[PDB]
Design an enzyme around this catalytic site. Structure first.
Site, mmCIF file in Angstrom:
data_model
loop_
_atom_site.group_PDB
_atom_site.id
_atom_site.type_symbol
_atom_site.label_atom_id
_atom_site.label_comp_id
_atom_site.label_asym_id
_atom_site.label_seq_id
_atom_site.Cartn_x
_atom_site.Cartn_y
_atom_site.Cartn_z
ATOM 1 N NE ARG A 51 -3.260 -0.958 2.805
ATOM 2 C CZ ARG A 51 -4.530 -1.233 2.283
ATOM 3 N NH1 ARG A 51 -5.125 -0.240 1.177
ATOM 4 N NH2 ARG A 51 -4.761 -2.413 1.640
ATOM 5 N N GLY A 106 -3.729 4.732 -3.197
ATOM 6 C CA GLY A 106 -4.342 2.999 -4.474
ATOM 7 C C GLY A 106 -3.829 1.797 -3.254
ATOM 8 C CG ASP A 129 7.707 8.567 0.282
ATOM 9 O OD1 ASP A 129 7.731 8.949 1.670
ATOM 10 O OD2 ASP A 129 6.214 8.252 -0.140
HETATM 11 N N1 LIG Z 1 6.244 -4.514 -8.191
HETATM 12 C C1 LIG Z 1 6.228 -5.283 -6.627
HETATM 13 N N2 LIG Z 1 6.692 -6.851 -6.443
HETATM 14 C C2 LIG Z 1 6.451 -7.351 -5.353
HETATM 15 C C3 LIG Z 1 5.281 -6.709 -4.254
HETATM 16 C C4 LIG Z 1 5.486 -7.452 -2.994
HETATM 17 C C5 LIG Z 1 6.021 -7.148 -1.825
HETATM 18 N N3 LIG Z 1 6.205 -8.028 -0.891
HETATM 19 N N4 LIG Z 1 6.334 -8.643 -1.349
HETATM 20 C C6 LIG Z 1 5.650 -10.507 -1.414
HETATM 21 C C7 LIG Z 1 6.945 -11.594 -2.042
HETATM 22 C C8 LIG Z 1 7.115 -13.199 -1.252
HETATM 23 C C9 LIG Z 1 6.675 -12.820 0.349
HETATM 24 O O1 LIG Z 1 6.706 -14.539 0.712
HETATM 25 C C10 LIG Z 1 5.322 -12.245 0.550
HETATM 26 C C11 LIG Z 1 5.825 -10.467 -0.087
HETATM 27 C C12 LIG Z 1 5.593 -8.982 -2.786
HETATM 28 C C13 LIG Z 1 5.774 -5.275 -4.312
HETATM 29 C C14 LIG Z 1 4.945 -3.866 -3.249
HETATM 30 CL CL1 LIG Z 1 5.134 -4.243 -1.762
HETATM 31 C C15 LIG Z 1 5.231 -2.769 -4.298
HETATM 32 C C16 LIG Z 1 5.034 -1.482 -3.718
HETATM 33 C C17 LIG Z 1 4.556 -0.934 -2.740
HETATM 34 C C18 LIG Z 1 4.549 0.140 -2.259
HETATM 35 C C19 LIG Z 1 4.673 0.741 -2.887
HETATM 36 C C20 LIG Z 1 4.236 0.668 -4.624
HETATM 37 N N5 LIG Z 1 4.235 1.587 -5.008
HETATM 38 N N6 LIG Z 1 3.939 0.869 -6.545
HETATM 39 S S1 LIG Z 1 4.281 -0.548 -6.482
HETATM 40 C C21 LIG Z 1 4.689 -0.201 -4.885
HETATM 41 O O2 LIG Z 1 5.384 -3.427 -5.476
HETATM 42 C C22 LIG Z 1 5.565 -4.738 -5.169
#
Ligand SMILES: Nc1ncc(-c2cnn([C@H]3CC[C@H](O)CC3)c2)c2c(Cl)c(-c3cccc4nnsc34)oc12
Length: 296
Positions: free
Chosen positions: A19, A23, A131
């Site tokens: 998050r 969004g 940020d």
């Molecule tokens: N493109 C992305 N791909 C993957 C992830 C994401 C984060 N944790 N995980 C999983 C990975 C496997 C673990 O077992 C459990 C957590 C995937 C995430 C995540 Cl979290 C974000 C994210 C977070 C905050 C702001 C934002 N803006 N654009 S993408 C984004 O983007 C992602």
């Protein structure tokens, strides 16, 4: 630039996994590939999501999240699935945590500066992230490659430059401050200002009064000099991101093994206390050895 239009019906939404500033980001599937989508929560944040789309369509750099495409109804961005999750989660998340080396710490920070430098060099007007923090830094390729996301633009006070709190005219140099704090965080494996705690205003008062993270025992002087220049009160005394890239690129001669994937677990009792200086998580013995061979 341009954007690939995507049919929402062709996307299959799995679990919610993050998050951002606005969004909500979720894991998903699309056209025989693992993918992360980012849907709107409300109609109020539509205009923000469009400006983000207009910027992302223009950017193209190895250390910024690949945007495959977007949907217009409903509004969502289709991104690469960062296998390794966020840097925040790698540093501070649920056990078992992975072992990482000084080489990983410096490589991560170099890659971040490479991406931010690309945004700061954008023409006609520079893109400021505003940020920069480990929850917005994703890892791929076994934890070796870093990518910036959620750029352009709460819970961020610990990485945020003093002139941003004050509502003062600010610049590119606010990202250099954030980067400085991130360098301390990967070296120490500590949440900055975790011991201050409380609500966001308490960290803001602290940092506004000159508080910075404690100095690190045995940190090489060249790295300590860059780190502390990055978190000057006066933004004109901070180096440009282009200077940080050059310095960090040169230092990597003394930090081999950045391409080794994170695969070993780590049992964690990072030794707290000893007010004033703190111990690093990473080990600099190999740095000092290699430095000595080149110099004497
Ligand atoms: N493109 C992305 N791909 C993957 C992830 C994401 C984060 N944790 N995980 C999983 C990975 C496997 C673990 O077992 C459990 C957590 C995937 C995430 C995540 Cl979290 C974000 C994210 C977070 C905050 C702001 C934002 N803006 N654009 S993408 C984004 O983007 C992602």
């Amino acid at each position: 630039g341009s954007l690939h239009m995507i049919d929402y019906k062709e996307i299959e939404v799995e679990e919610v996994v993050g998050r951002g500033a606005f969004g909500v980001v979720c894991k998903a599937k699309w056209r025989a590939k693992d993918v992360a989508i980012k849907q709107i929560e409300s109609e109020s944040e539509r205009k923000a999501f469009i400006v983000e789309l207009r910027q992302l369509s223009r950017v193209n750099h190895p250390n910024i999240v690949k945007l495959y495409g977007a949907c217009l109804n409903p509004v969502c961005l289709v991104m690469e699935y960062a296998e390794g999750g966020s840097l925040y989660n790698v540093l501070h998340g649920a056990e078992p945590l992975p072992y990482y080396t000084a080489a990983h710490a410096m490589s991560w920070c170099l890659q971040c500066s490479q991406g931010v430098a690309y945004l700061h060099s954008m023409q006609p007007k520079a893109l400021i992230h505003r940020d920069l923090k480990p929850p917005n830094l994703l890892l791929v390729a076994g934890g070796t490659v870093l990518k910036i996301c959620d750029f352009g633009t709460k819970g961020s006070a610990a990485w945020m430059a003093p002139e941003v709190f004050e509502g003062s005219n600010y610049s590119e140099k606010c990202d250099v401050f954030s980067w400085g704090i991130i360098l301390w965080e990967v070296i120490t494996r500590r949440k900055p200002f975790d011991e201050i705690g409380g609500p966001a205003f308490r960290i803001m008062w602290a940092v506004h009064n000159g508080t910075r993270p404690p100095l690190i025992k045995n940190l090489p002087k060249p790295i300590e000099s860059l780190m502390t220049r990055c978190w000057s009160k006066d933004p004109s005394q901070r180096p440009s991101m282009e200077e940080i890239v050059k310095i960090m690129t040169h230092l990597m001669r003394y930090f081999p093994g950045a391409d080794e994937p994170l695969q070993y677990p780590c049992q964690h009792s990072l030794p707290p206390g000893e007010d004033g200086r703190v111990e690093p998580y990473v080990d600099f013995a190999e740095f000092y050895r290699l430095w000595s061979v080149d110099h004497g």
